[PDB]
Structure 1
Amino acid sequence: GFLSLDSPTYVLYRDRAEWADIDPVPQNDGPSPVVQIIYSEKFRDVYDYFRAVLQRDERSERAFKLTRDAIELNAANYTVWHFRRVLLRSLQKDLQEEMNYITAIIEEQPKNYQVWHHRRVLVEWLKDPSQELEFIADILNQDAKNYHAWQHRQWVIQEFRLWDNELQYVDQLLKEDVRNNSVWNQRHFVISNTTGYSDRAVLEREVQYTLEMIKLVPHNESAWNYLKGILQDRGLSRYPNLLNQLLDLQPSHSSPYLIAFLVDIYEDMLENQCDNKEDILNKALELCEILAKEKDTIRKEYWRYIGRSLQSK
Structure 2
Amino acid sequence: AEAKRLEREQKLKLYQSATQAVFQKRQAGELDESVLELTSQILGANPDFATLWNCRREVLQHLETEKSPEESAALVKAELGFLESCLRVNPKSYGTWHHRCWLLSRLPEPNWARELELCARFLEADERNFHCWDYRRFVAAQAAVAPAEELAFTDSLITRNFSNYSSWHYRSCLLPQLHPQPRLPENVLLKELELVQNAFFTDPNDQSAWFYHRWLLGAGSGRCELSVEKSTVLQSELESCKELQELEPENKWCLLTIILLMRALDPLLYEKETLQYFSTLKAVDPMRAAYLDDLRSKFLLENSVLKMEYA
For the superposition of Structure 1 and Structure 2, which TM-score range results when normalised by the shorter chain?
0.7 to 0.9
Task: Kindly state the Cα deviation for residue 308 of structure 1 after the two structures are TM-superposed.
Answer: 2.5
TM-score by length of 2: 0.77
Q: How does 1:272-287 map to 2 (within 5 A)?
A: 277=268, 279-287=269-277
One-letter amino acid matched to 2:176: S
Structure 2 CA distance, aligned partners of 1:302 and 1:233? 22
Match of 2:13 in 1: 41
One-letter amino acid matched to 1:207: L
- SS of residue matched to 2:300: coil
One-letter amino acid matched to 2:16: R
Q: How does 1:154-303 map to 2 (within 5 A)?
A: 154-163=137-146, 164-195=148-179, 198-234=184-220, 237=223, 238=226, 239-254=230-245, 255-267=251-263, 277=268, 279-292=269-282, 294-303=283-292
**What is the Cα-based RMSD across aligned positions, in Å?**
2.5
Task: Kindly state the Cα deviation for residue 263 of structure 1 after the two structures are TM-superposed.
Answer: 2.2
Preserved CA contact (<8 Å) 1:289 1:304: no
Task: Kindly state the Cα deviation for residue 90 of structure 1 after the two structures are TM-superposed.
Answer: 0.5
Structure 2 CA distance, aligned partners of 1:256 and 1:249? 15
Task: Kindly state the Cα deviation for residue 240 of structure 1 after the two structures are TM-superposed.
Answer: 2.4
Q: Taking structure 1 as reference, are residues 158 and 52 closer, same or farther at Cα in structure 2, changes over 3 Å only? A: same
Q: Does 1:146 align with 2:124?
A: no
- SS of residue matched to 2:44: helix
- SS of residue matched to 2:270: helix
> Which protein has greater RCO, CA pairs closer than 8 Å, 6+ apart?
2
Preserved CA contact (<8 Å) 2:238 2:261: no
Q: Taking structure 1 as reference, are residues 312 and 247 closer, same or farther at Cα in structure 2, changes over 3 Å only? A: same
Q: Deviation per CA, 1:44-71: give whole Å up to 9, x if none.
A: 1111111211222321222232222232
Q: Taking structure 1 as reference, are residues 143 and 179 closer, same or farther at Cα in structure 2, changes over 3 Å only? A: closer
Structure 2 CA distance, aligned partners of 1:235 and 1:308? 24
TM-score by length of 1: 0.77
Task: Kindly state the Cα deviation for residue 83 of structure 1 after the two structures are TM-superposed.
Answer: 1.4
Q: Does 1:121 align with 2:102?
A: yes
Aligned residues: 270
Structure 1 CA distance, aligned partners of 2:50 and 2:163? 34
- Structure 2: unaligned runs, 5 residues or longer: 1-8, 65-71, 246-250, 303-311
- Structure 1 segments of 4+ aligned residues over 3 angstroms from their partners: 195-201, 265-269
Structure 2 CA distance, aligned partners of 1:109 and 1:295? 39
- SS of residue matched to 1:145: coil
Task: Kindly state the Cα deviation for residue 117 of structure 1 after the two structures are TM-superposed.
Answer: 0.3
Task: Kindly state the Cα deviation for residue 241 of structure 1 after the two structures are TM-superposed.
Answer: 2.4
Preserved CA contact (<8 Å) 2:176 2:184: no
One-letter amino acid matched to 2:124: N
One-letter amino acid matched to 2:106: W
Preserved CA contact (<8 Å) 1:243 1:262: no
Structure 2 CA distance, aligned partners of 1:105 and 1:39? 18
Which stretch of the first structure deviates more once superposed, 84-93 or 207-216?
207-216
- SS of residue matched to 1:76: coil
- SS of residue matched to 2:176: helix
Q: Deviation per CA, 1:287-307: give whole Å up to 9, x if none.
A: 222211x22222111112222
One-letter amino acid matched to 1:297: P
Q: Deviation per CA, 1:128-156: give whole Å up to 9, x if none.
A: 22311100111112212111111111222
Percent of counterpart pairs with the same letter?
21
- Structure 1: unaligned runs, 5 residues or longer: 1-36
Preserved CA contact (<8 Å) 1:136 1:149: yes
